[PDB]
Amino acid sequence: APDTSVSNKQNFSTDVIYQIFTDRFSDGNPANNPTGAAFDGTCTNLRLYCGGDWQGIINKINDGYLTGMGVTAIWISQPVENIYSIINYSGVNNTAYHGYWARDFKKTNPAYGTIADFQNLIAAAHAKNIKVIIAFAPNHTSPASSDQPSFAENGRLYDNGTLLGGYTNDTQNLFHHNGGTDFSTTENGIYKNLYDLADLNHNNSTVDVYLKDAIKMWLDLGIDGIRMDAVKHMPFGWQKSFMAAVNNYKPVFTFGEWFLGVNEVSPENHKFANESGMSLLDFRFAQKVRQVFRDNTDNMYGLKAMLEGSAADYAQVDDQVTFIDNHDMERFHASNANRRKLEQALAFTLTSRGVPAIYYGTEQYMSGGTDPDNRARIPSFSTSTTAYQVIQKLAPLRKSNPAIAYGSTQERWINNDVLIYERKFGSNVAVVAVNRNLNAPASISGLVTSLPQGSYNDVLGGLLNGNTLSVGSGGAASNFTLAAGGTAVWQYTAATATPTIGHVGPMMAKPGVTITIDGRGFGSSKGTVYFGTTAVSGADITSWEDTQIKVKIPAVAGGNYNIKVANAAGTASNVYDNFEVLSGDQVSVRFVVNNATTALGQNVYLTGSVSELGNWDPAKAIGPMYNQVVYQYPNWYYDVSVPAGKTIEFKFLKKQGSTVTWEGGSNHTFTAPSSGTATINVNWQP
Ligand SMILES: OC[C@H]1O[C@H](O[C@H]2[C@H](O)[C@@H](O)[C@@H](O[C@H]3[C@H](O)[C@@H](O)[C@@H](O[C@H]4[C@H](O)[C@@H](O)[C@@H](O[C@H]5[C@H](O)[C@@H](O)[C@@H](O[C@H]6[C@H](O)[C@@H](O)[C@@H](O[C@H]7[C@H](O)[C@@H](O)[C@H](O)O[C@@H]7CO)O[C@@H]6CO)O[C@@H]5CO)O[C@@H]4CO)O[C@@H]3CO)O[C@@H]2CO)[C@H](O)[C@@H](O)[C@@H]1O
Ligand SMILES: OC[C@H]1O[C@H](O[C@H]2[C@H](O)[C@@H](O)[C@@H](O[C@H]3[C@H](O)[C@@H](O)[C@@H](O[C@H]4[C@H](O)[C@@H](O)[C@H](O)O[C@@H]4CO)O[C@@H]3CO)O[C@@H]2CO)[C@H](O)[C@@H](O)[C@@H]1O
Ligand SMILES: OC[C@H]1O[C@H](O[C@H]2[C@H](O)[C@@H](O)[C@@H](O[C@H]3[C@H](O)[C@@H](O)[C@@H](O[C@H]4[C@H](O)[C@@H](O)[C@H](O)O[C@@H]4CO)O[C@@H]3CO)O[C@@H]2CO)[C@H](O)[C@@H](O)[C@@H]1O
Ligand SMILES: OC[C@H]1O[C@H](O[C@H]2[C@H](O)[C@@H](O)[C@@H](O)O[C@@H]2CO)[C@H](O)[C@@H](O)[C@@H]1O
Ligand SMILES: [Ca+2]
Ligand SMILES: [Ca+2]
Ligand SMILES: [Ca+2]
């Protein structure tokens, strides 16, 4: 099958996602609607259930609303059963309409539908070439109070109907009891509760095994991707072991929600996306786009800087999920704003690197403040809005032109208000011009591109006041006027002679697992696949065609490898780096080191005899470790994904910048559990 096939669960770069807030999209089955004080059929009270369900989504898939727009993927509110409580937060009733207050990760939220309904959704979507992503929020259960067990459902967690425990009298320590986070530090936000939500303790074996078994149930139901919620608030090491469980079973595109504020560039964020096994929602992209196209707090130079910086900071920038708004922030389109601002932001996002995700209702020019005002019921299913047409015209390009899906990004023309950028992959090219100034046109002279000589029509057909482009020899474009608010897209596609890799997924797994290599120019005959210097050919290459290769990871030592392929003739492709071969199945283990004193700025890290611990390379040591919440300085702790059942030697380090101080004595040693969790507690050796 080609890279663009709906069956490709490992690559969403050729797709356009539609963010569906289930309760607010379409009530296709009034019979499953909640009743009484928990429901408002008019959807005036945005904190109660309005009735939106999976049958509704199926209907909108079948009547062409989404397909007519060029949407090829959707994500939905967490499908698992939520609490049924109607919580009164200071005179206002609140329900779990949003799906984030889970009580049973192995059952469905009856308001959205039954397991049968979910199966029907997966089937209907796939029949229309639409992939399905589910939100999954394993960070917590629901609102709770340990002193007041009668409040809500006391954050109780059930295992397919069987009660495991609640927040009160939690002798099993299924949850954290460290108060609520104040977001002061990453550690603080991980081991303390978000709001009043009962924080799950992933170091508890029951919780660990339960959640991994739960996600596998959904994987078996045929989901195509996972949107991990609140990933900045769960142990990064545990999450890596979670992604390993997923990838070593049935790998599907996974990305997490890690909020970044305006002007926030986070090295931790980058590292997480680069080493966790999942990518992230591109807040850096979203926030900059809002600054430039919505709030006028930065110009095109800032947009360019974001594009160049992110392409260098994220190992796989093409896996970051882009957007201009979501279910938490104010909708991009302000009531009194010119609609062209939204239309340009959409065009920009749809033609830029990554995986575009459009919040439901954006195309209907919905406006709204922060939660819950940004969650109104979609007011119309009109295909006649300009925004709907913009998406309809550009979304399909991610499938037809690989430069959009996998291409590099290069600024070709720029000033305060104008940015003309080029996407290029193999012989494929796309050039996009955007003039955010709604009052002043710009004279574009001296524009040079990789487009072959010829005349190019605006893919938007002038919808956003674009124009035709005339390209002479050398890719030089004839002088033209870019209209005020003008947005144009010019593109070129052609066969690529040389094998070219545009995407690889998953990027982390143990040997034997099948990975998907997408691109162009692979040829129809099986070639060779390289993991570092190791060559793979023949039987282990399950399938091979021009745009997609399915190949099993060879039994090489755990570590980071460059991926490369060669066609049957022996011509080598470009290198796709940062592939992590795991040393085997993974388990999450908590390491605790006692009496490790340090100077301000100096932190403790973990190093060891397996790749999961950096193979004794301080530059790849695990950390910085924590020392405030679960354990207190001079004691440090950290949760780490390590190969199950392996005997591992390790030591702790104290690092100040790249300056390292090693534990003295012999290495510490332990054998990781075969499944579940474990805690290894040792003393710092001088
Ligand atoms: O021994 C003393 C005492 O200890 C214990 O009590 C402590 C608690 O255990 C501890 O958690 C802590 O609770 C307090 C909080 O720290 C504090 O912040 C405060 O919480 C308020 C909050 O400040 C209010 O704003 C309000 O919250 C609102 C939000 O503002 C709304 O936006 C909304 O939210 C929900 C969203 O609508 C949902 O979509 C979803 O959000 C998800 C996002 O959409 C998604 O993108 C993201 O990634 O993930 C999100 C989560 O899935 O869920 C949101 C949360 O439900 O609605 C909420 C609710 O109205 O209200 C909260 C609650 O009041 O006050 C807390 C109570 O004090 O501190 C306690 C005291 O130290 C013991 O439990 C106790 O018995 C002991 O006596
Ligand atoms: O995000 C919050 C902060 O995180 C990081 O801070 C960590 C430090 O870099 C790391 O050294 C350690 O800090 C411990 C000190 O090493 C240790 O000496 C002692 O600190 C003393 C201090 O020496 C003394 O001068 C002062 O009067 O009292 C301090 C005791 O509170 O304990 C420290 C731990 O409490 O761990 C820190 C994380 O907990 C970032 O480096 C920092 O910039 C962030 O603000
Ligand atoms: O990769 C080949 C070798 O791998 C393994 O060796 C690793 C060690 O097992 C591991 O402990 C660590 O070694 C560090 C020491 O633990 C640490 O004490 C220090 O050693 C200093 C020593 O303190 C000092 O007295 C002496 O003068 O210099 C030593 C350094 O040469 O740093 C060590 C790291 O440089 O990392 C080792 C890998 O680098 C296998 O155990 C070994 O058999 C293999 O040959
Ligand atoms: O002609 C090559 C040149 O094209 C672009 O330069 C633009 C510049 O961005 C505009 O602001 C204005 O000064 O016109 C120039 C072309 O004459 C590229 O930005 C530049 O890197 C490239 O060399
Ligand atoms: Ca319904
Ligand atoms: Ca947490
Ligand atoms: Ca890369």
Entry summary:
InterPro entries: A-amylase/branching_C (IPR006048), A-amylase_C (IPR031319), Alpha_amylase (IPR006046), Carb-bd-like_fold (IPR013784), CBM20 (IPR002044), Glyco_hydro_13_cat_dom (IPR006047), Glyco_hydro_b (IPR013780), Glycoside_hydrolase_SF (IPR017853). By secondary structure, the protein is α+β, with helices and mostly antiparallel strands. 18% of the residues lie in helices and 28% in strands.
Structure explained in plain terms:
This protein is α+β, with helices and mostly antiparallel strands and 686 residues long. The protein has four domains: 1-400, Glycosidases (TIM Barrel); 401-495, Immunoglobulin-like (Sandwich), CATH 2.60.40; 496-582, Sandwich (Immunoglobulin-like), CATH 2.60.40.10; 583-685, Immunoglobulin-like, CATH 2.60.40. An eight-stranded parallel β-sheet has the order 14-13-12-7-2-1-16-15. A five-stranded mixed β-sheet has the order 26-33-32-28-29. A four-stranded antiparallel β-sheet has the order 17-18-19-24. Helix 1 packs parallel to helix 2, helix 7 (283-294) packs antiparallel against helix 8 (300-313) and helix 9 (339-351) packs parallel to helix 10. The termini are far apart. Bound molecules: a molecule of 7 linked components (BGC-GLC-GLC-GLC-GLC-GLC-GLC), a molecule of 4 linked components (BGC-GLC-GLC-GLC) (2 copies), a molecule of 2 linked components (GLC-GLC) and calcium ion (CA) (3 copies). A molecule of 4 linked components (BGC-GLC-GLC-GLC) binds at residues 185, 598-603, 627-628, 633. Residues 315-316, 577-578 line the site of one calcium ion.
